[PDB]
RNA sequence: GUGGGAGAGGGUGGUGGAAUUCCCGGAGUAGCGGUGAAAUGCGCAGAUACCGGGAGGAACGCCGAUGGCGAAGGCAGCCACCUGGUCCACCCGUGACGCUGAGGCGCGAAAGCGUGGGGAGCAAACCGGAUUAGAUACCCGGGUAGUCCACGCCCUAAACGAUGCGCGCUAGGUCUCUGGGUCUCCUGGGGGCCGAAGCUAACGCGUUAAGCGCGCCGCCUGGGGAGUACGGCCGCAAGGC
Ligand SMILES: NC[C@@H]1O[C@H](O[C@H]2[C@@H](O)[C@H](O[C@@H]3[C@@H](O)[C@H](N)C[C@H](N)[C@H]3O[C@H]3O[C@H](CO)[C@@H](O)[C@H](O)[C@H]3N)O[C@@H]2CO)[C@H](N)[C@@H](O)[C@@H]1O
Ligand SMILES: NC[C@@H]1O[C@H](O[C@H]2[C@@H](O)[C@H](O[C@@H]3[C@@H](O)[C@H](N)C[C@H](N)[C@H]3O[C@H]3O[C@H](CO)[C@@H](O)[C@H](O)[C@H]3N)O[C@@H]2CO)[C@H](N)[C@@H](O)[C@@H]1O
Ligand SMILES: [K+]
Ligand SMILES: [K+]
Ligand SMILES: [K+]
Ligand SMILES: [K+]
Ligand SMILES: [K+]
Ligand SMILES: [K+]
Ligand SMILES: [Mg+2]
Ligand SMILES: [Mg+2]
Ligand SMILES: [Mg+2]
Ligand SMILES: [Mg+2]
Ligand SMILES: [Mg+2]
């Protein structure tokens with residue numbers, strides 16, 4: 001119980017899971033959700049539908065804190081990123097803006113063999 | 120590095136006559152300058168090989184010029200060596 | 208003797224006293240290392256593109272000098288000692304290369 | 309094909325080697341902090357090559373960004 | 382020689398931001414991760430996701446290319462110092478001083494060795510989870526040497542253009558890097574493509590020759606046995622010639 005009413009929405013999307021963290025404008029989190037929070041267990045967490053459910057859960061949880069406008073921040077390239085976006089777009093939350101913050105190294109660290117043939 | 124003034128100094132020093140930039144003596148002189156400078160560079164920085172190749176090439180060129188002089192005019196050869204102080 | 212350009216970025220929060228002291232130390236250290244100052248541009252505070260030392264802005268000094276090459280590096284060291292100096296970049300001066308002329 | 313505009317043609321007389329001039333150099337950076345390609349800058353090999361170094365200099369001096377956040381999407 | 386030019390050519394010192402991991406603080410809750418699907422693993426001693434601060438190690442995103450440099454190996458954030466090669470213009474100087482080069486000497490990716498340091502990420506061996514008929518593998522979670530620095534060894538390779546070096550001659554067209562000029566164009570050096578003559582078993586090469594010629598070096602002589610055995614030299618060893 002805070003009554004923030006305006007804040008940020010972080011979408012962390014990977015080919016495995018999608019997970020959403022809604023925070024106050026300082027960056028400190030309020031609530032969060034993910035494909036695991038909904039009943040989905042295995043690979044189904046990577047599903048766009050799982051992402052939709054996740055974003056919606058996070059939004060509805062943040063409604064209870066009485067939040068209205070959000071700033072969307074997107075990270076990672078994964079299935080069901082845009083679906084999470086569209087989910088938050090009309091959740092009843094006003095989406096003020098969207099930004100892709102995905103971290104790209106300037107080539108610091110040798111990737112796992114999985115991600116190699118790159119740096 | 121090597122400034123124009125030093126270069127002109129050694130040229131006019133070893134020039135066989137006024138206006139001579141190209142004589143064997145002048146060439147050997149200039150090369151000796153570059154060689155000594157590079158060796159003093161390579162006492163420190165002794166892990167720099169790419170330059171050491173250049174040193175090798177310069178030494179070679181000098182030895183060929185000196186050889187030529189020695190063949191044509193042994194007097195000028197001796198004089199040049201004594202003036203430079205080569206041969207160790 | 209070569210012609211360089213010293214860039215110095217210091218704390219924007221400095222009151223005129225501390226600032227004057229810093230510029231004083233810059234002059235001092237400069238003369239100590241034998242650099243003649245051809246000209247100077249004080250650009251004051253400007254808005255950095257990224258936070259430096261947690262501060263969103265910075266104060267800019269630019270000196271076009273002429274100094275013995277051998278000690279240039281040795282100069283920068285000294286200039287970086289002061290806490291209030293958050294950036295030092297020394298650059299060999301170059302004739303301007305104009306585009307779209 | 310980048311038929312919108314070239315950064316060189318959209319600009320006047322200026323010095324490529326001046327790292328302190330932001331209001332020009334900024335035009336050579338993308339929506340993100342990235343240096344633009346020859347397609348966008350309309351420069352030449354030599355020109356672009358000098359632009360790169362001066363831009364990097366400006367970056368270190370704190371005048372230009374290394375990176376930025378992508379708006380919209 | 383004088384005057385100019387371009388470059389990730391080399392060595393030393395300093396320095397910049399992005400990211401990964403770890404630590405500290407805030408906020409926050411039931412999972413995160415991973416896969417074809419999973420499980421091991423991590424998480425209620427509060428992880429994942431988010432903000433802030435700090436430590437350290439390694440590599441330099443965009444520029445960036447079909448680009449540039451180097452004899453080869455190879456070279457990429459930025460700054461300064463030291464230093465090698467090279468190209469053009471002038472037509473100034475010496476006067477055949479040239480080319481090649483057995484042996485010698487130096488350089489020589491990665492892996493590997495010795496001593497000391499360092500250790501973030503990655504990762505032989507190894508410990509587990511899967512898959513499978515089995516799986517001493519591919520996939521997943523960990524992880525030591527090592528990868529990094531200094532000093533000294535090692536001397537190998539699909540060390541490749543699978544094309545030794547130098548010089549002369551033999552249509553052009555086109556793209557490009559880099560100089561000069563009376564700057565549509567001409568001229569010089571370098572990197573590509575298509576092609577005259579010619580060559581080639583063919584594929585293809587074709588002023589960057591695999592064409593026409595001269596000089597000098599290295600090498601080949603059916604396949605397996607075999608880059609083995611013996612001897613010698615080199616090496617701390619692995620092993621090399
Ligand atoms: N070499 C390092 C680099 O040099 C760049 O610039 C280099 C080149 O552009 C410049 O060229 C010089 C110049 O005097 C002019 N263009 C002609 C001259 N022959 C060249 O000098 C050349 O020959 C001499 C030996 O005589 C070498 O010592 C030197 O390394 C070499 N560049 O000399 C500089 C040093 O070699 C930039 N400073 C930077 O990229 C970096 O420091
Ligand atoms: N750091 C600049 C470079 O340093 C080289 O040598 C330096 C580095 O290779 C070496 O590593 C140092 C290390 O001593 C010190 N204890 C920690 C420091 N972070 C390291 O410095 C470097 O480490 C690696 C490259 O090795 C880089 O990724 C990193 O950005 C850089 N900081 O330390 C040397 C100096 O003590 C060469 N001089 C040349 O490449 C260049 O000047
Ligand atoms: K290339
Ligand atoms: K071993
Ligand atoms: K021109
Ligand atoms: K044919
Ligand atoms: K072909
Ligand atoms: K050999
Ligand atoms: Mg999953
Ligand atoms: Mg030769
Ligand atoms: Mg300081
Ligand atoms: Mg270099
Ligand atoms: Mg270097």
Ligand SMILES: [Mg+2]
Pocket residue numbers: none
């Ligand atoms: Mg960091």
Ligand SMILES: [Mg+2]
Pocket residue numbers: none
């Ligand atoms: Mg914590």
Ligand SMILES: [Mg+2]
Pocket residue numbers: 422423
């Ligand atoms: Mg784990």
Ligand SMILES: [Mg+2]
Pocket residue numbers: none
């Ligand atoms: Mg673990």
Ligand SMILES: [Mg+2]
Pocket residue numbers: none
């Ligand atoms: Mg437990």
Ligand SMILES: [Mg+2]
Pocket residue numbers: none
């Ligand atoms: Mg457990």
Ligand SMILES: [Mg+2]
Pocket residue numbers: 425
């Ligand atoms: Mg509990």
Ligand SMILES: [Mg+2]
Pocket residue numbers: 426
């Ligand atoms: Mg604990």
Ligand SMILES: [Mg+2]
Pocket residue numbers: none
């Ligand atoms: Mg436990």
Ligand SMILES: [Mg+2]
Pocket residue numbers: none
């Ligand atoms: Mg974490």
Ligand SMILES: [Mg+2]
Pocket residue numbers: none
């Ligand atoms: Mg942090």
Ligand SMILES: [Mg+2]
Pocket residue numbers: 437
């Ligand atoms: Mg540590």
Ligand SMILES: [Mg+2]
Pocket residue numbers: 445
């Ligand atoms: Mg690239």
Ligand SMILES: [Mg+2]
Pocket residue numbers: 472
């Ligand atoms: Mg003449």
Ligand SMILES: [Mg+2]
Pocket residue numbers: none
């Ligand atoms: Mg004559």
Ligand SMILES: [Mg+2]
Pocket residue numbers: none
């Ligand atoms: Mg030879």
